[PDB]
Symmetry: C2
Subunit: 226 residues, 2 copies
């Protein structure tokens, strides 16, 4: 039945499941929401299901479904992420926090029934006990970023690079350098893109009636040439 | 709390009208949408009614209703903006773009019937034709910022300061230094706040089916103690 970008023409439910271990602190996060790739929008709510998150919510934003990007008409032949569905893709990252520790993640993003599911394993290491991460000095907010994409022909996939700017409580900015690769899970045809980028913007919020450690997350993402 | 704050317990329709003249290039913008102060959320659509906008949409974001900020229960005594309603307030700014020109604006924000209305006059001068504003070199996106508020006792109102970070197409960032004053229109008592700030986050988007020059704008804002 439906395949590739066909799976994204309406509103699609989303489920995110993360198991993390950072500097030995183990934790899990579950998210649910929906995505609307026609407008490049999604909304998610995340709960730390193991109690208190041991790292700031903003550090996990990138780890916690780029298949919901709006690709303008002229760029449809360059949308790798939807082309891999429903069987999906593996997304692996290494993330370095400036003057501090690193995250390493591996995720499978694929359809399970009618839901787009992102299941992730993450390990963090080398963090300073009173750095911005373990010391909880990051502002609860997020900025706009460009996500650069190119074909990785040997893996029949893509390589992705960008840097996140995290606002720190003292008015400084800490960079988190991201290195990412995506490879299809299935063996069917996928679209291997010309070099381009995703213009990504987000906002983090809270439900003042929710008592659990949580994050309400809004994202707007559109692909663009160059 | 304040009497005016009770006007914001639901979803309030918004109308925005702006006339601008930047280096002699004149334009008007009309906006409509709704605000939800309980969650600190705004959604607005803006249309350049004079045709094509001669400056980047991002430069107009701050000019184009901080009465929609979520003030947590323990900070409701510091919400000047809602307290001045429904009579409203005058909001004046000067905005200095780094190594470039300045905007000056004067707005009246008040209720007209059921609708919160923001009507603004904006003048921009001294811009470089090859700078990021007149040369239209700003990316179509927006970042998170802290908006710092303090009482201006002599004016029975508040002074507000913040620096916006505008992402530029070459990867640089251009600051826009905002200086702002708000003064009640009405005679009623208003809340004069302790020093605090608004955590503000935004995202700019497009409706692919809208052919007029326009901006779909989403904002999330919550007051926080210093």
């Amino acid at each position: 039945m439906s395949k590739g970008a066909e799976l994204f023409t309406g509103i699609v439910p989303i489920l995110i499941e993360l198991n993390g271990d950072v500097n030995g602190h183990k934790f899990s996060v579950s998210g649910e929401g929906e995505g609307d790739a026609t407008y490049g929008k999604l909304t998610l709510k995340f709960i730390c299901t193991t109690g208190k998150l041991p790292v700031p919510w903003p550090t996990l934003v990138t780890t916690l479904v780029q298949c919901f990007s709006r690709y303008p008409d002229h760029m449809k032949q360059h949308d790798f992420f939807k082309s891999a569905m429903p069987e999906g893709y593996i997304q692996e990252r290494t993330i370095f926090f400036e003057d501090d520790g690193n995250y390493k993640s591996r995720a499978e993003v694929k359809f399970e029934g009618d839901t787009l599911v992102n299941r992730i394993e993450l390990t963090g290491t080398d963090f300073k006990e009173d750095g911005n991460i373990l010391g909880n000095k990051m502002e609860y907010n997020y900025n706009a970023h460009n996500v650069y994409i190119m074909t990785d022909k040997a893996k029949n996939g893509i390589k992705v690079n960008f840097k996140i700017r995290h606002n720190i409580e003292d008015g400084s900015v800490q960079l988190a350098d991201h290195y990412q690769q995506n490879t299809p899970i299935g063996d069917g045809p996928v679209l291997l893109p010309d070099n381009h980028y995703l213009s990504t913007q987000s906002a983090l919020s809270k439900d003042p009636n929710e008592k659990r450690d949580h994050m309400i997350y809004f994202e707007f993402v559109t692909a663009a040439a160059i």
